[PDB]
Structure formats: structure tokens, C-alpha cells
């Protein structure tokens, strides 16, 4: 398995995902429109942050990354657009880190840039929280690139895999830098306990694992739950896919027990990510110029 | 209902499991009589503004879990160790207190005082934030619809809640200064450490504290997800929880040797304390 694929299922599963969201979430996500200059403010900061790492990346590639933030926040409830712009920058620059050959990982060079982004957009205390989460994320991505721990958690069972993904997919980082956008106390506390990350991990990870399976197997990347099944076996795939859909539904139904603003945010993240993932260049083909490995 | 009809068998089954999968037994940390008094003085000073007194016996009951569940082979900082002793004991008191007794204005400063006494500046912020998050979570979720949904839906929703609520995430973020081991610090700060150890800690505590919490109408206990009266269903459910512990423990063994030691000493350590301590023999 290195040239295995979920291509045959692409159509049916997208419809299965879509019908699950129509039944259980209902409310469609709405894309944040960035003005002319906000978009270039963001992209300018993004280049500045990765510039020390010595790899050019395109405005096309930036706008691929930033799409998840434009689509998966909660525009009904946004209050702080400076915090929003920060999440755009931080998520974009850590995507680059994610897509990057570990030889290009310079902490001494990159970590000061993360701190600068945070101090620019947040107040003193939010900046510290956003930075520790940024630091932990890029440190975790680097730590596990060939770790035996990653192999154990990703090959043992769904539970061990999703436990790894709370940090690795970046959703704990996302909550801890997104709470200042909303200035909602309940959500802020769920972000700080990581309950918010834990509630949304499977919904984000299952969707992303399906649509990025082809790219990741081609690159030898083993962090994908559908590697726990034989995708060439249609019966095994469909049974596994079904249990992953049950996981998403159970999570969503428990999310509805949270207060109204908080659950709106959780569901806009799960559903928004699905709209971005299924409409974006990054998940259209295994290898292209917005998702190719950034190497030596 | 009660799980006393099962206590004898399940204790042996727990032990058999640890003997096979962990083997290395926990050992109790001995404090000098000076150290014990410093801890108890710090504990009494932190709870005093809340207006409740705590017997010296009940403090030593609480501190048992820290004496037994650290990894004495790897300790490099006894000031950090006494911090955990103090922080664990005082947050125990907060756990057992009626929500009306909860006052953040008075208690949060005492937590920060403790962390500032025993830790460097960076560690003190990490320990204090985790202490704040724990007591704020325990308060927030008393009679919360969220807690009811997460504890009555499935084991998976339940254990997700317990990562924070049982206090293991707090434990790791206040305990990594004890060891100054760079890998363990990172797993502690990602909360991977807490996630790896949540079920081993929670399943044990849930079994032995089931009787108390059912009497007090507390729902945060996984054995309320099965019918403890039906002994077939109980044995089935208890086996699945045992399988949960075994899988976690085998995956923990892929962590580095020192980190793996701390994780397993934590889970096994808590089982010995729980089974022997005053806290868990009557409601
Ligand atoms: Mg990744
Ligand atoms: Mg990736
Ligand atoms: Mg992926
Ligand atoms: Mg309790
Ligand atoms: Mg409790
Ligand atoms: Mg208990």
C-alpha cells in the first residue's frame, strides 16, 4: 500500500457526508469575505513568517491554506477581526510547516516569527496562549515525523489514532487561537481545557482523512484512519466508513448539548472544513502546486 | 445500587492485569517529617479563605495518591514534588465541596501563591493555568447538561470528559517539572500524556468510588453506563473496560523509557492507593 486509493468511493462518500450534515447539522457554513487589503495584510505577514525558512510559496498556495479559516469559523458570532486575521496567518504558516521536509524545520528561526504574529494581533494574555499552542503544534509535527509512537497510535485502533489527532491535526491549536475571535466565556474555557478540540477532532479528522488519503499514501504519510482498513475491499471500506460516520454523528449530537453560541462554532468548524475540503485544489489531486511537498 | 458484590473479584482481576502488563510495581515516596508539615501547612493556608478546616488525617489521605503514583526513580526536583502534593490535596477539597463554597476570588490567589512558591516562572504559569482550568471545570459542570450528555452517551464521550475532569491533564502539567525530561514535558504540554493515561486512571477510580458517588447522586462514573445489578452485563462491561486499559498500556510502552515509566507508575500507583485508602471503603 503506497499507490492505494479511495478514488472509487469519492462520489458516494461525498454524498454520504453531505446527507449526514443535512440531517444532523442543518445550518450551512458561510465563507468570511476578506477585503482587498485584509487578504494582502494576511499574505504579507505569512511570507514574513516563513521567509527565514528559505522557501518561496505562492499567493495561490496561501489562499488554498487560508480557505479553511475563511470557511470554518463562525461568522454569526465573530467579534474580533484582528484575532481572525491572526488565525489566518498562524494557520497558513503552520500548514507550510506541515507540508515541509523536516530538514527545513528551524525552530530558532521560525518560533520567533510565531511569537511576533501573536504579539501583533492579540493582547498580552491571548498572545501567550496562542503562542504556546502554535509552538506545541509545530513541535509535535516535527517530533513525530518518523516516531515509533506515531506508528503505534496510528495502527492500533481508531481510539488511539484519534487520541493522537487531537494535537496532530491542529484542532487544539485552532481552538486556543480562535477563542479571542468570539470573546465568549464558555467557549474560551472549553478551548483552554481542550474539551472543544476533543469534541471536534473526529469530525475534522474523518473528513480530512478521506479526502487526503491519496496524497498521504503517495508520500508515505501514515497518519490517516482509513489506513486502518483495506480500502481495496469494498465491503471492509464501507463498514469502516460507516463506523466513522457513526462517530461523527455521536459527536455532533453531544455538541448540541453545549450552549448555543459554542455549538454553533463547533458545527461551523466541522461543516465548514467539509465545504472547504471538497471544493479546494489541495484535495483535488494527490500532487499539485498547492499541496506538493516543500522539500530540500 | 452498588458494586460491592463485585469488589473481591474485580480487585483480583485488576491486579492480575497489572502484574501481567506493567509488572514493575509502584513504590511510596517517603517525606521527611519536615516536608510533610510544610505540605500540610500550605494546604491549610490555601483552603482557609474558603472557611473550611481539614483534618491532618484527611490531608494525608489525599496526599497518598501523589506519594504512590509518581515515579521515584526519575525525580529530579522535590520542590516540584511538594507542589504537586499541595495542589492535588487542595483540589481534592474543592472536588468534595458544595458549589456554593466555591469562591474563585479567594482560592485562585492561593493557587498562584503555591505555584509561585515551588516553581520557576514559566512552570508556575503552566501549573497555575492547569489548576485554574481544573477548578473552573469542576465548578462549571456541576448540574451541567453537557456533563449529563457526555457521561450518559457512550464510554467514548465519557472518557473524553474525564481527560480534564478527573484531573489527569492538570496532573501532568504540574508534574513534568519533577522530572525535567524533555520528552515528558512535551507530551504533558500537548496533553497527549493525559490522554494516554485517562482510561487507566478513570476506570479504576470509577469502580472503587461508584458507591460513594451513586449515594451522592453524582453521574460522573462510567459504570453508570451499564446495569450493575445484572451481573452478566457487568462482567461484559467490566471486561471491555479492562481491554481499554490493556490497549492503552501497550501503546504507552512505545513511549520513551523514562516517559513510559512515569505513565505506568501513575496508573498502577493510583490503583494501589485507591484500593487501600480510607477514601474508597465507604460512601
Ligand atoms: Mg499533519
Ligand atoms: Mg499534512
Ligand atoms: Mg490529512
Ligand atoms: Mg469526586
Ligand atoms: Mg470530580
Ligand atoms: Mg470518582
Amino acid at each position: 500500500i503506497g499507490r492505494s486509493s479511495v478514488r472509487p468511493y469519492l462520489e458516494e462518500c461525498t454524498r454520504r457526508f453531505q446527507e449526514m450534515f443535512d440531517r444532523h447539522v442543518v445550518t450551512r457554513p458561510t465563507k468570511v469575505e476578506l477585503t482587498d487589503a485584509e487578504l494582502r495584510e494576511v499574505i504579507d505577514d505569512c511570507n514574513a513568517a516563513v521567509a527565514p525558512l528559505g522557501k518561496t510559496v505562492s499567493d495561490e498556495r496561501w489562499i488554498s491554506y487560508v480557505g479553511v479559516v475563511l470557511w470554518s469559523q463562525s461568522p454569526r458570532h465573530i467579534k474580533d477581526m484582528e484575532a481572525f486575521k491572526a488565525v489566518c496567518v498562524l494557520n497558513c504558516v503552520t500548514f507550510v510547516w506541515d507540508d515541509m521536509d523536516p530538514a527545513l524545520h528551524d525552530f530558532g528561526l521560525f518560533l520567533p516569527q510565531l511569537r511576533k504574529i501573536c504579539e501583533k494581533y492579540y493582547g498580552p494574555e491571548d498572545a501567550e496562549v496562542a503562542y504556546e499552542a502554535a509552538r506545541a503544534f509545530v513541535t509535535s509535527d516535527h517530533m513525530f515525523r518518523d516516531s515509533p509512537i506515531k506508528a503505534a497510535l496510528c495502527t492500533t485502533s481508531p481510539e488511539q489514532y484519534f487520541r493522537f489527532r487531537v494535537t496532530d491535526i491542529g484542532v487544539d491549536f485552532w481552538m486556543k487561537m480562535s477563542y479571542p475571535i468570539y470573546r465568549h466565556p464558555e467557549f474560551t474555557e472549553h478551548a483552554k481545557t481542550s474539551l472543544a478540540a476533543r469534541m471536534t477532532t473526529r469530525g475534522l479528522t474523518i473528513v480530512n482523512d478521506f479526502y487526503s488519503y491519496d496524497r498521504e499514501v503517495s508520500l508515505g504519510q501514515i497518519t490517516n484512519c482509513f489506513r486502518l482498513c483495506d480500502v481495496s475491499d469494498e465491503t471492509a471500506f464501507k463498514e469502516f466508513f460507516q463506523a466513522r460516520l457513526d462517530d461523527m454523528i455521536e459527536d455532533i449530537e453531544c455538541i448540541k448539548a453545549f450552549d448555543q453560541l459554542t455549538q454553533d462554532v463547533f458545527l461551523d468548524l466541522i461543516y465548514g472544513n467539509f465545504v472547504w475540503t471538497t471544493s479546494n485544489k489541495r484535495y483535488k489531486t494527490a500532487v499539485n502546486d498547492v499541496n506538493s511537498r516543500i522539500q530540500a
Side-chain angles (χ1 to χ4, degrees), chain A:
Chain A
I1 286 201
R3 265 221 70 150
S4 70
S5 176
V6 285
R7 183 63 185 79
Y9 314 111
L10 200 145
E11 278 271 37
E12 169 58 8
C13 291
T14 305
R15 175 211 106 208
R16 284 269 261 147
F17 281 129
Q18 180 63 67
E19 143 189 332
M20 185 280 300
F21 284 109
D22 298 328
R23 181 167 69 247
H24 298 275
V25 174
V26 185
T27 313
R28 284 214 76 121
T30 38
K31 170 164 178 180
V32 166
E33 322 177 301
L34 272 196
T35 72
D36 57 285
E38 299 172 311
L39 190 48
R40 187 96 229 169
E41 176 174 22
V42 157
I43 294 192
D44 275 321
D45 284 0
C46 284
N47 284 321
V50 290
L53 291 195
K55 282 294 153 153
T56 280
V57 316
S58 324
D59 292 356
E60 189 194 1
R61 186 157 187 150
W62 282 133
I63 282 191
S64 175
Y65 296 149
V66 84
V68 65
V69 184
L70 311 180
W71 270 114
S72 320
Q73 294 287 349
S74 203
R76 263 172 302 168
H77 304 286
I78 292 175
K79 296 196 207 147
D80 184 341
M81 275 306 291
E82 293 298 305
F84 189 94
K85 272 181 280 173
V87 171
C88 291
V89 179
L90 290 170
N91 217 59
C92 284
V93 299
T94 51
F95 253 107
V96 176
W97 187 274
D98 183 79
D99 279 348
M100 245 181 189
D101 191 297
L104 293 158
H105 280 167
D106 200 295
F107 291 90
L109 284 176
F110 192 48
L111 286 194
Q113 297 305 313
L114 294 191
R115 164 164 290 285
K116 167 54 155 105
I117 295 158
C118 289
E119 277 163 8
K120 172 189 172 191
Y121 288 109
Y122 301 108
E125 305 106 296
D126 295 346
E128 290 310 310
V129 179
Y131 170 76
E132 163 68 3
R135 177 210 71 80
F137 170 81
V138 301
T139 297
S140 174
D141 175 57
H142 178 78
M143 264 183 92
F144 291 94
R145 292 305 267 242
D146 311 282
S147 171
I149 291 165
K150 186 156 99 165
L153 299 184
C154 291
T155 59
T156 291
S157 72
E159 295 115 286
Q160 313 293 332
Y161 170 70
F162 289 124
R163 176 183 306 152
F164 175 66
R165 287 298 243 154
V166 172
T167 299
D168 171 80
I169 203 163
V171 59
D172 189 41
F173 168 37
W174 169 290
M175 294 301 180
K176 289 174 171 166
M177 69 171 164
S178 292
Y179 77 77
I181 298 173
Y182 300 96
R183 307 185 197 137
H184 185 60
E186 282 93 330
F187 179 79
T188 291
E189 294 302 304
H190 298 308
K192 278 176 182 178
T193 62
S194 298
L195 182 56
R198 292 195 297 280
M199 293 299 313
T200 52
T201 290
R202 292 199 291 190
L204 295 167
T205 302
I206 281 148
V207 166
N208 173 265
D209 284 357
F210 183 71
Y211 294 105
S212 67
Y213 179 92
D214 281 19
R215 179 179 94 241
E216 281 159 10
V217 290
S218 77
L219 298 185
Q221 283 167 314
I222 70 141
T223 308
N224 184 302
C225 68
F226 294 94
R227 263 193 201 248
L228 293 163
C229 84
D230 190 357
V231 307
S232 62
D233 178 336
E234 180 160 13
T235 299
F237 177 79
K238 143 92 153 54
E239 167 168 320
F240 191 89
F241 189 91
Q242 177 65 46
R244 299 293 81 70
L245 228 42
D246 297 344
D247 292 353
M248 293 179 85
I249 289 163
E250 194 180 273
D251 285 356
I252 281 158
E253 287 306 318
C254 286
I255 287 175
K256 290 154 147 178
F258 284 70
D259 72 86
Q260 187 58 59
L261 193 159
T262 289
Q263 80 179 249
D264 286 352
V265 177
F266 288 177
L267 303 171
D268 276 337
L269 170 63
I270 297 177
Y271 200 176
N273 172 71
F274 174 70
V275 169
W276 170 71
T277 294
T278 52
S279 70
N280 203 260
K281 181 141 169 244
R282 176 175 177 84
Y283 304 103
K284 292 279 146 154
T285 60
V287 187
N288 55 65
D289 47 10
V290 314
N291 76 31
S292 54
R293 188 108 184 239
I294 300 167
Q295 213 184 17

